[PDB]
């Protein structure tokens, strides 16, 4: 709420959301799966492969808000974005694909030259962090709608297994949204806007999370076993260093 969206990032973000949707639809296309009319997942049909003109208002809006929240949170991390080259919009090239790859909607997605990108490990860790943030946003929406966590998915009790912290999140959905956000940030880069991240911070948390009373536990022999003469020896195995 504190930060505000610059206009240029907006006039790029509408097409950012559009080509995120293009990513998703072509993921489906090369997976080979097709659209289905009826809102039934189990009936071997999928109501998501919808033309952008007939695309649900709520779904397009939900994508638009994830895009704005993603770019805004990226800015709020301390990352600052710069337009070094205006010529990206001129050099930007469509990949030629066979007509069979085009979906029934009639619009042809154009995935650009993402491969030329140079990627830094801080930037992948950052992309993972925003994937975590998107998962947190989704979990917050589910919780306020009333969904709770469960080991087994049940719509009647509104219990879902994916409502878990990102560290414990299943790798399937983790990579599933990781690739989408990776492509989003990748295209934001490819359009001539490079991002510059704040430097990584090193710190020692010391895993201090014990009770207030105890920070350490002291074990000892009984006082009656005190030795006052001689040579004595014992051993201490360290299971954890
Ligand atoms: N990894 C992903 N990348 C991009 N879009 C995704 C991804 N996973 C899901 N989506 C899309 O986002 C929306 C997810 O909402 P959905 O209807 O699946 O939620 P839900 O039924 O509340 O979920 P759940 O029952 O798993 O808690 C759908 O429009 C779906 O197509």
Report the separation in Å between the CA atom of 83 and the middle of ligand 1, taken as the mean of its atom positions: 32
- SS3 category, 131: helix
Q: H-type helices in 98-221, by residue range? A: 121-145, 171-190
Which of 180, 182, 183, 184, when mutated, tests ligand 1's pocket best, judged by the most ligand atoms within 8 Å of its CB? Answer: 180
The tokens describing 205, both together, are 């948390």
Is there a contact between 22 and 111 (Cβ–Cβ < 8 Å)?
Answer: yes
Q: If phi over 0 gives left and psi between -120 and 50 gives alpha, with beta otherwise, what is residue 158?
A: left
- Cα 134 to Cα 179: distance, rounded to the nearest angstrom: 13
> Taking a C-beta distance cutoff of 8 angstroms, is the pair 25, 109 a contact?
yes
Mutate to test the pocket of ligand 1, among 136, 142, 148, 171 (most ligand atoms within 8 A of CB): 142
Cβ neighbors of 29 (< 8 A, separation 6 or more) are 101, 103
Q: DSSP character for 223?
A: G
Q: State the Cα–Cα distance between residues 238 and 9, nearest whole angstrom.
A: 55
Structure tokens at 174: 């983790």
Three-state secondary-structure class, residue 81: strand
Resolution (A): 3.0
Q: How close is the Cα of 116 to the center of ligand 1, in Å?
A: 30
Tokens for 141? 């929406």
Instruction: Tell me how far apart the alpha carbons of residues 166 and 50 are, in angstroms, rounded to a whole number.
Output: 30
What phi, psi does 159 have (nearest 5°)? Answer: -115, 130
User: Ligand 1 test: best mutation among 17, 23, 24, most atoms within 8 Å of CB?
Assistant: 24
CB 91 within 8 A of CB 191: no
Residues having CB within 6 Å of any atom of ligand 1 = 24, 48, 59, 142, 160, 162, 176-177, 180
Antiparallel, parallel or unpaired: β 159-160 and 148-149: parallel
Nearest ligand 1 atom to the CA of 180 is: 3
């Amino acid at each position: 709420s504190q930060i505000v969206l610059p206009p240029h990032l907006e006039r790029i973000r509408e097409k950012l959301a559009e080509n995120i949707h293009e990513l998703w639809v072509m993921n489906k296309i090369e997976l080979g799966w097709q659209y289905g009319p009826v809102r039934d997942d189990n009936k071997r049909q999928h109501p998501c492969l919808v033309e952008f003109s007939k695309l649900p208002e709520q779904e397009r809006n939900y994508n638009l808000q994830m895009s704005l929240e993603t770019l805004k949170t990226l800015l709020a991390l301390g990352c600052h974005v710069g337009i070094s080259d205006e010529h990206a919009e001129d050099k930007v090239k469509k990949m030629k694909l066979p007509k069979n790859y085009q979906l029934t909607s009639g619009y042809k997605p154009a995935p650009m030259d993402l491969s030329f990108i140079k990627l830094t490990p801080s930037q992948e860790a950052m992309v993972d962090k925003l994937a975590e943030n998107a998962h947190n946003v989704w979990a917050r929406d589910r919780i306020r709608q009333g969904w709770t966590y469960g080991i087994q998915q049940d719509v009647k009790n509104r219990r879902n297994p994916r409502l878990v912290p990102y560290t414990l999140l299943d790798d399937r959905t983790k990579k599933s949204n990781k690739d989408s956000l990776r492509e989003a940030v990748r295209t934001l880069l490819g359009y001539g806007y490079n991002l510059e991240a704040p430097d990584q911070d090193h710190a020692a948390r010391a895993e201090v999370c014990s009770g207030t009373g105890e920070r350490f536990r002291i074990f000892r022999a009984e006082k009656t076993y005190a030795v006052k003469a001689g040579r004595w020896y014992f051993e201490f195995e360290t299971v954890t260093a």
